[PDB]
């Protein structure tokens, strides 16, 4: 699936400079291309091959040669440079096959910390008029990516029927995640309250929500 | 001005047949350049299937040149994409691409010794299960006084028990882009997807304005349009 080696992941400090580097016995034929993956989306292409660009990247992404290994630098990183680098040639023998490298996870340190945004939803009138009933508990805007979240029923913790997502990187490098409370509409309507305590860098968030 | 768009099934019985196709607007599929087809598992880096030249010639993956096959059809242009005998391990999101051509020999000007992907598409996403297809349930996360947060409000859309992905969420047929955010969806214990999508409006044009979600789920061809009135 891949052919050349390169760092899966790699840290360089907000200002600083970085240089992943794409390795292989494939390369020494054709030029190298860079290209970036944001989540979400579609990779787009920085380099063309050599130290060619196309419009839209800044003049700190350069590419260079030495030999089996190709090097994309990036001088004086940005947070808008977190993503997902793949370098990419051709094979020189044979019929030249298109040849991708691992890719890299460029992580940017030193961006500014957030505290999570927790937006609670109770089970909708037009999901319970079909029997059903599920508690949204959505999180959002958080750095880091480390998160707890825990689901009370009144006072007393629950377990059963939660499903949550391991946190995930938004298209502003801050985090999200979602935690689903699956219950009858008459365990919804037994209780006086239900919460979700959302736990970040030891501060916790907690939202409320009963029948009303 | 270039633009190309993938289409295709989003769910492909093992050992079934997956093809996809890629059209193409403002270029011709039928040039000299290579227009490729790379795929990339959930969770993992790209992987490069083949390409088509003039509408012809073909290279595929060495791993992959058993079970692949790329044709064109230069009157719609269009290039598709055929992979059989697919496994569990096909499941990918699949692009469509173009490189640049190049020379095989080392006699060629400078120009011939590129390889890059400069043009993409979206990008299609096919699971390979067994099981069967299911539709969403939508329901409206309608907005409270404890979903306020002073001069906006929070509201939403429940998309419930569907498989298999992707789901697409717009609001109000597109015109309302900003303050949406669609969460990744969670896969539950019973096998199907669920997600949410949030969009933040002003609390004070809540009874003045109809907010309605726009779900797409293509691999049931399922289009659920959910009113999202206030609480």
């Known amino acids: 699936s891949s052919e050349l080696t390169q760092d899966p992941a790699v840290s360089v400090a907000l200002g600083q400079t970085v240089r992943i580097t794409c390795q292989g016995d494939?390369?020494?034929?054709?030029?190298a291309s860079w290209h970036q993956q944001k989540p979400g989306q579609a990779p787009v292409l920085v380099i063309y091959?050599?130290?060619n660009r196309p419009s839209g990247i800044p003049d700190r992404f350069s590419g260079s040669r030495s030999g089996n290994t190709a090097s994309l630098t990036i001088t004086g990183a940005q947070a808008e440079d977190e993503a997902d680098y793949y370098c990419?040639?051709?094979?020189?023998?044979?019929?030249?096959?298109?040849?991708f490298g691992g890719g890299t996870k460029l992580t940017v340190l030193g961006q500014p910390k957030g505290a999570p945004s927790v937006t609670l939803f109770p089970p909708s009138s037009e999901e319970l008029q079909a029997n059903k009933a599920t508690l949204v508990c959505l999180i959002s805007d958080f750095y880091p990516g480390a998160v707890t979240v825990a689901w009370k029923a009144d006072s007393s913790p629950v377990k059963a029927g939660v499903e949550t997502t391991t946190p995930s990187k938004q298209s502003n490098n801050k985090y999200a995640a979602s935690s689903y409370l699956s219950l009858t509409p008459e365990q919804w309507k037994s209780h006086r309250s239900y919460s979700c305590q959302v736990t970040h860098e030891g501060s916790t968030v907690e939202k409320t929500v009963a029948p009303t | 001005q270039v633009q190309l768009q993938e289409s295709g099934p989003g769910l492909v019985k093992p050992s079934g047949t997956l093809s996809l196709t890629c059209a193409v607007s403002?270029?011709?599929?039928?040039?000299?350049?290579?227009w490729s087809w790379v795929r990339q598992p959930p969770g993992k880096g790209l992987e490069w299937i083949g390409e088509?030249?003039?509408?012809?010639?073909?290279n595929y993956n060495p791993s992959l040149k058993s079970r692949v096959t790329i044709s064109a059809d230069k009157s719609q242009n269009q290039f598709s994409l055929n992979l059989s005998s697919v496994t569990a391990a096909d499941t990918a999101v699949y692009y469509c691409?173009?490189?640049?051509?190049?020379?095989?020999?080392?006699?060629?000007?400078?120009?011939?010794?590129?390889?890059?992907?400069?043009?993409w598409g979206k990008g299609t996403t096919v699971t390979v299960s067994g099981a069967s297809t299911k539709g969403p349930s939508v329901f409206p996360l309608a907005p409270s006084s404890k979903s306020t947060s002073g001069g906006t409000a929070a509201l939403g859309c429940l998309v419930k028990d569907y498989f298999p992905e992707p789901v697409t969420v717009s609001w109000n047929s597109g015109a309302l882009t900003s303050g949406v955010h669609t969460f990744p969806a969670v896969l539950q214990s019973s096998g199907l997807y669920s997600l949410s999508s949030v969009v933040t409006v002003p609390s004070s044009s809540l009874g003045t304005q109809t907010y309605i979600c726009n779900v797409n789920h293509k691999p049931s061809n399922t289009k659920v349009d959910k009113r999202v009135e206030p609480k």
């Open positions: 691409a173009r490189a640049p051509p190049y020379c095989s020999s080392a006699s060629c000007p400078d120009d011939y010794y590129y390889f890059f992907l400069d043009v």
């Open positions: 403002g270029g011709s599929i039928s040039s000299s350049q290579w």
């Open positions: 088509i030249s003039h509408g012809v010639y073909t």
């Open positions: 494939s390369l020494r034929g054709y030029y």
């Open positions: 091959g050599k130290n």
């Open positions: 990419a040639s051709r094979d020189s023998s044979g019929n030249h096959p298109v040849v």
